[PDB]
Amino acid sequence: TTAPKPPSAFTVEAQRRVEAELPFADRADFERADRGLIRRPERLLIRNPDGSVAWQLGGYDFLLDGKPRDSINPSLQRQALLNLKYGLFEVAEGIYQVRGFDLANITFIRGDSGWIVVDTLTTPATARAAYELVSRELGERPIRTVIYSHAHADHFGGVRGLVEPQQVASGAVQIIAPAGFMEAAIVLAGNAMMRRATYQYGTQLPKGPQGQVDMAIGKGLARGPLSLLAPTRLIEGEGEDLVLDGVPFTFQNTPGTESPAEMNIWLPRQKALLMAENVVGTLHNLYTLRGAEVRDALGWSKYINQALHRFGRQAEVMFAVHNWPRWGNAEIVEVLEKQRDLYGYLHDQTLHLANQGVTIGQVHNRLRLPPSLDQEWYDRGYHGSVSHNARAVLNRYLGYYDGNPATLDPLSPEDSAGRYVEYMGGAERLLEQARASYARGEYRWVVEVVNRLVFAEPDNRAARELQADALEQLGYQAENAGWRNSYLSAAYELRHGVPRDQGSADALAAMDTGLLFDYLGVRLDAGAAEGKALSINLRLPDIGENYLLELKNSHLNNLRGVQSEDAGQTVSIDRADLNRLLLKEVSAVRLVFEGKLKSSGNPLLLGQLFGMLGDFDFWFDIVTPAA
Amino acid sequence: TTAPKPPSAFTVEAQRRVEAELPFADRADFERADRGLIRRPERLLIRNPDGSVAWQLGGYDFLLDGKPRDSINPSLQRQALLNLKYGLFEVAEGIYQVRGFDLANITFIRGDSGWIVVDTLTTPATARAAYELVSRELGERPIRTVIYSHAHADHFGGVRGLVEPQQVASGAVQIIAPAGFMEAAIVLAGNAMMRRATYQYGTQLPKGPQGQVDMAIGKGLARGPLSLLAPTRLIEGEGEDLVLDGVPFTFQNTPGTESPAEMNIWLPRQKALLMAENVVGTLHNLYTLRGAEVRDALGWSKYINQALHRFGRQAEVMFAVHNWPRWGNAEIVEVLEKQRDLYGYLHDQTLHLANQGVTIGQVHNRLRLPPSLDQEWYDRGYHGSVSHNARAVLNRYLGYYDGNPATLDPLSPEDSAGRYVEYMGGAERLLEQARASYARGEYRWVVEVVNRLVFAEPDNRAARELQADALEQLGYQAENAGWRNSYLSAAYELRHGVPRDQGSADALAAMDTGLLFDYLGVRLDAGAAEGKALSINLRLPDIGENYLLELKNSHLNNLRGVQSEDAGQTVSIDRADLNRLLLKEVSAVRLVFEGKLKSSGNPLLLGQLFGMLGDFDFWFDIVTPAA
Ligand SMILES: [Zn+2]
Ligand SMILES: [Zn+2]
Ligand SMILES: [Zn+2]
Ligand SMILES: [Zn+2]
């Protein structure tokens, strides 16, 4: 049947096992998340200018009860409660945070004349709504300075809810980031990334006991326009000691951790340590299951130890861009140490195992945390997991292949499935014996093999539903947010199928010219390029950039700071205008007649180049072979 | 049984099918490889100071008749002959390389008063044996200058074969390398790598039609001591223009291509362009099979184009650190162009398909090169392959997890395998069907499925012998040198089982202290460190260095530039001696009595720490679960 089935007796047995292993008697965080609450709006409904709902908490009311339900891992349900403690907070003297308005927190520091604001949330609507609370409770003041902790959409995404661009250009507002920021915010596997993000965040899922419950570092993500205002000042080297509105500020770049650009903030007046997303109320991801580049556990662990050693020693509160503060120099030194040696263990021991021959596809089943790290709530794998970080690590050092030539050149799962089912007595006998495995709770095994049958015959109703039940039974058990979301999302589309009938200005403007052409490079229908050849000098004089375009062997090349004598067209167009072109906010025909788009040589060639460009459908099949 | 089997009907149909796919008619490389030949010595026999053979070519005699064999892919056979074209060569005026003294080429350039040497092969014996031949053939000259094209050992490792410390330190010999060479030269999965490397290079195989025929960038790899001297000057920035003993050199750095530190070299006076390992006679690795970090196809494509646009236009000969030179600006331009568009198409088209939802499991079965690139020998996947570079590329952007929560949390292959065999009736009905499939040629199917049973029942001789039979046919088929070797090394361990048979001073000397201790942390047995906690101030007075060592929650941390007044112990020891300690040249005890190892605080802690350092077996089980 197509609906969410109650937890099975094993799934419950699993939840009972969690009670037995995790120190639930430690309830301190509940006090730490309550501390300093200034205002908690009775209800929260934040609306984008479109009329759409960015952000909403009432779909999580069923959590407010605090009662058990057994289709939720009880450790995860605990984090889901603590992430529902939203509103305005004092962290320390003149430093404040609004939590539970979005995935991340926005943080307000008092200066002599007005707010220094750290990060800005995902979208303008929630940023705005958050600063309005700061204006209602603490009294209205202007935003002189906005600091990006690190280069994620979670933190620069609502900057247009707070300030608007002429304040920046005029300089009523400054905007600060670590060196690396603009390069790091910016694409090339974005369609793939955003589709597998629907899984990881469970975006089709309803909010509920069988659906979405929590996203580890927050409830979830706000939806709406993404914005992006460039920094006017960058922190270089190892950091800077700056004064902003008369408040002293220490930046400590940790490049190449949870982001390529990132920095911790040390506030010596309040003895406050704002640790970016380096350290939060969860084991962070080394590899997001969304799809990404692997992250350096080792430099991660090493930068937390540098923070322990320069600031952790003399700190009084430690707070972050997600989750909540911990006060007390003793709790601060311990947590930092434990987090330091979390990313260290994951790293050191994963590779220690790999130096004993344990592959990328075994290491997750062998690595376990020592008690002193497993028994911490801030060390649970809510966002990242022990399992998939150790592979991520393994994958960082040795790549995807396990050393075994049996798997050096595999057949696609759809083309391999048919013979798997034929060897196993066919579907009806594959299933029959699968149910027997289902009926004793080997949900990790049933998902692997029934998967084969769904790929061999994706119209087989029976294959999908059983696979779904194994997947949903597996999700109810999940401690990690992304896992739970991911699993249940699969079950959703096996039961119903996928949707059938289905830009940022700031982002495309943020995107480097060279990289646009690199993004453009990904466009190319090779079928259309086959046999083709052209070269085109592009010049964009607003930013003083000249590029050589060269298509040949079904590949678009681009090279900054060179032109050719032999190029068959010269195009001359401001980058500003070229974005409007790709954003369709002007017509090219309108640009050329305006004398904004200039041409010499063959005028067709640029048009030909863009004619050969395919597109990418958002709803591609993940759980079945292509429809 | 235990011996190698003939090519099957389906193996040599496959060998045939290459027949028409590939232009055996262009044999123009053969004149390319023959040209400039000054001497191919009678036979090649290079020994180390050991008495053992570094290098020898007489085991490749079977190819010298040059008759095709169906146990070899005819394209690899073409390369394998081409790489037999060893000896001393002229490339241009006053430019010579010896080829076929090691995996790479060594390059001698005439100066006003001596040689400029570019690269050093793998080990001191071969580089000295090269240098002697050059000295016999066209006169003894000193090497005043040695240049490292890049940071792989097959190019620096033979430097002590040509020079040694006092001529460098007197300044009679300078050493040029690209900035960042030393960190690039030097660990953390050093053991895993190497053992998966025996399979890549097929160190266990015989040289024969039924073993190791070639290694794509050359014959194979010489065996010997690994040396390394430090540079005296570095090329920084985008590059630099020097005059060495009257000869004008231009250096174009290409960092983060085949090596993190690399440079192409341009010689204007002969119009000669030495293209490092950016451009050689083969599709190179993006992802080495032994296990390493994914490399950046895109930067690689672009640096070739950049070189195309600075030099290629005006080059007359283009030679490289592997394989053979090519003459004619028209050819030289063309080759470059194709190579540029090769890695770029690889990068773009993987990302294109990925953006349409083609996962890490399908992509290599989707992507194909277009003819222009396919039908050039130098674009053949001998070293790297289109099939594993795509997956690497997909892997660099999205990671190892293909998106399907059926694979999110797999059971190890040896805990699921059993049911995979019970699912297929039993080791009876798996072998029955599997030998049926073997008769129809389905070798990529069979190596997958039987590996289920070899993992389920790692003693079953019929599973082991069949798996081996299917893997060998695949190895004969394979166009790739690593692939072939891996397939035919797997076969060899399945049949005979894995040996039960049972370090470079310069290498450790060049290893940063932090990095040395990062690796020691990896050696830490997690069981012996549980619950303990110690902190050590390490001082290394020779190099001015100070480290804080901290073990806690089962993790070894190390921190440069820090000292704690609460450390339980302070150990004071020249890095040079800590080297010697780790190279077992000298004992801990003797260093105490020579006043070379001093202590204060708790004198025992350093010993306790080292006591908790475990060890690794080299010969770990790859083709079966851990014995
Ligand atoms: Zn982030
Ligand atoms: Zn965030
Ligand atoms: Zn190399
Ligand atoms: Zn090499």
Curated annotation (Swiss-Prot), chains A, B:
It catalyses: a primary linear alkyl sulfate ester + H2O = a primary alcohol + sulfate + H(+). It is an enzyme of class 3 (hydrolase). Binds 2 Zn(2+) ions per subunit. Keywords: Hydrolase, Metal-binding, Periplasm, Signal, Virulence, Zinc. It is found in: Periplasm. CDD domains: arylsulfatase_Sdsa1-like_MBL-fold. Zn(2+) 2 binds at residues 154-155, 277, 322. Zn(2+) 1 binds at residues 150, 152, 258, 277. The keyword Chloroplast does not apply. Sulfate binds at residues 285-290, 295, 383. GO terms for molecular function: identical protein binding; linear primary-alkylsulfatase activity; metal ion binding; protein dimerization activity. Disruption phenotype: Insertion mutant cannot grow with SDS as a sole carbon and/or sulfur source. Disruption of the gene leads to a decrease in the growth in mucin minimal medium and a reduction in the degradation of both carbohydrate and protein moieties in mucin. Mutant shows reduced swimming, swarming and twitching motilities and decreased mucin gel penetration ability. Virulence of the mutant is attenuated in leukopenic mice compared with the wild-type strain. GO terms for biological process: dodecyl sulfate metabolic process. It comes from the Bacteria. Gene3D superfamilies: Alkyl sulfatase, dimerisation domain, Metallo-beta-lactamase domain, SCP2 sterol-binding domain. Contains three distinct domains: an N-terminal catalytic domain that contains a binuclear Zn(2+) cluster, a central dimerization domain that ensures resistance to high concentrations of SDS and a C-terminal domain that provides a hydrophobic groove, presumably to recruit long aliphatic substrates. Although separated by the dimerization domain in terms of sequence, the N-terminal and C-terminal domains are spatially directly adjacent. Belongs to the metallo-beta-lactamase superfamily. Type III sulfatase family. Homodimer. This is Linear primary-alkylsulfatase. It comes from Pseudomonas aeruginosa (strain ATCC 15692 / DSM 22644 / CIP 104116 / JCM 14847 / LMG 12228 / 1C / PRS 101 / PAO1).
